[PDB]
Each structure stands twice: as C-alpha cells, then as structure tokens.
Write a protein that binds this DNA or RNA. Structure first.
Length: 276
DNA sequence: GCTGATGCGTCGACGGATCC
DNA sequence: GGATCCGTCGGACGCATCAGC
C-alpha cells in the first residue's frame, strides 16, 4: 500500500557514472508551491535541469525566489495565450540550451502553454503537461486529437536527435500505474483511449518508460494523489508523471526516481539520471 | 482599490443493483 | 448477507473574476 523509493543509482549499467540530473515536477501553482518551500526541496535535489508543470503563472507575475537559484540561471517559461491562471510549463536549466522551441508545431494544440522543447548537444529535452481528459470525459476527443499530434511531433523530433520526454503526461498506462484501476476505466486519465494512445506513442516513436523499464513489476509507485480524500497519506495514487527516452538513451539510463516525501503540490517530483 | 464570495478545472467512498 | 460490478456525488486546491464594500 505504502511506497518507499529505492536508493539513488548513480552509475549506468556499463559502470559509467551519471552526468545529467533532470528533475520534473507538477507544482499545482508556482506561487503557492514556492510559498510551500518547494524550492528549498529543489535546491537539495540539485538538478541539472528542472522542468515544471501547472505553473499557473504569467511571466510577469513570477515570484522573486526564481532568481535566487544560481544553479539554474537559464529559465524558459510558457503560458496560455487566452487567459491567466491555467496550465503552463517551465524549464530551468543549469546550462544554456542550444535551442528552445515551444509547443508541438500545430496551431490547435499550442494555445495553452503545455510543451517546451530544449535542444542540447547530445539530446533534446521535451517537457510537457498533456491536456487532461476532464471530468465527464467532456474533453476526451480533444485529447485524442492531441495524442496523435503529439505522437507525430515527438516521433519526428526523435528522428533528428535522442529524445527525453518528461513531465505530467496525464494518463496511467497500465492497471499497475494506479491504485484503483477498475473503478476508473471510465475516469479521465485511465480510459482505454488514453491508455492506448500512450501505448501507441511508446512504440511509434519509439520511447521507453524510464521507471517501469527498471522496475517493471513494482506497484503502488505513484506520482499523484488527490487531496480530497486523504489519498496521499493512504497512498492511493496514480502514476501520471513520466520520463520517456528514445532507446538510444537506454544504455545511458542510471535510474529514475519518485521522490514521494517532497510536499508542495498534489504531485511529487520525479528525477532522471542519464549518463551522457 | 481592497476583500471575501463564488466559480472553474483538476475520483475515491459510498451505496444500490444483481447473481449466488 | 456477502462478493463483484457500476453510477453518482460531496469536496480540496490554487488560480482568476466579481460583487460588495
């Protein structure tokens, strides 16, 4: 029922040590999260790259603390065009990315502030906040439109350069990736359609599920728990937040964590260790 | 202009039907 | 009544907007 994450494995299968520490994290409000001491946690995790989801902040109103980070000088933000207070991703890197695109190059799917590409010397990092399917599955057909457009996008981008996809992808792939699989076959985030899109993306590109690639049988491994019904303490959660790697990066994979003791948000941080 | 009130977006506990 | 399968619904958040001062 409860979960304890394994010790950090900082050496690749080949014995090579880790060189990249990417940490992604849905903050459920960037200003509330900072008020909840989120960055004191981040400073201790000391990532090379910090990716953020559901910032719900405009580049104007960013808190000041976001400056007091001397290890992640290069910070790239992203918000919905229409209206304040929704969605919105961030990406903070220690070193300057060669390039920084935004969105998946598709007018329909870029208005909401969900995707940030970031090209590096040996790979490209995409951090995402995939559109939720919504209560009542009222936004479910949008999400399918998006799934295929995002699959097609990333497939292309992994042609050109090894791909690291991370962030809240808002589906739980298998029954194992959530606490209550049956009572949610029709909930946003575990529909047949959401689950098959992900499965399709996993192999069409192709991408590997960093965590389940090293811990393919370990359940109760959760990145999100709801805040209505005591779920986090009881460990009733979903695995909504991923690291998907091109198979080329698989020999470089040291470990993939789920830092479940870190509060600040209804999600918890997930860290990737890649030896590049 | 300030301040709370109400809203929008983001599911597991409970109870009722059913076959045994 | 007890096991399973399914349907509804109160309820927590962080944000914005808006009515009432």
């Amino acid at each position: 029922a409860l979960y304890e994450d394994p010790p950090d494995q900082k050496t690749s299968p080949s014995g090579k040590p880790a060189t990249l520490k990417i940490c992604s994290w849905n903050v459920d409000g960037l200003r509330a999260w900072i008020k909840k001491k989120g960055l004191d946690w981040v400073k201790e995790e000391a990532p090379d790259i910090l990716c953020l989801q559901e910032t719900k902040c405009s580049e104007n109103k960013l808190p000041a603390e976001l400056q007091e980070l001397p290890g992640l000088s290069h910070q790239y933000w992203s918000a919905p065009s229409d209206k304040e207070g929704y969605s919105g991703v961030g990406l903070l890197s220690r070193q300057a990315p060669l390039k920084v695109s935004y969105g998946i190059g598709d007018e329909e799917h870029d208005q909401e502030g969900r995707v940030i590409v970031a090209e590096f010397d040996s790979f490209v990092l995409v951090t995402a906040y995939v559109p939720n399917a919504g209560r009542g599955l009222v936004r479910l057909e949008y999400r399918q439109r998006w799934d295929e457009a995002f699959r097609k996008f990333l497939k292309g981008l992994a042609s050109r350069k090894p791909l690291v996809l991370c962030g809240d992808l808002n589906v739980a792939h298998e029954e194992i990736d959530l606490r209550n699989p049956k009572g949610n076959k029709k909930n946003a985030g575990f529909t047949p359609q959401e689950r098959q899109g992900f499965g399709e993306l996993l192999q069409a590109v192709p991408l590997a599920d960093s965590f389940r690639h090293l811990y393919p049988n370990t359940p109760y491994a959760y990145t999100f728990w709801t805040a209505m019904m005591n779920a986090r303490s009881k460990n009733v959660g979903w695995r909504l937040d991923y690291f998907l790697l091109s198979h080329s990066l698989l020999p470089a994979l040291c470990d993939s964590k789920i830092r479940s003791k870190a509060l600040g948000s209804d999600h918890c941080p997930i860290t990737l260790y890649l030896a590049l």
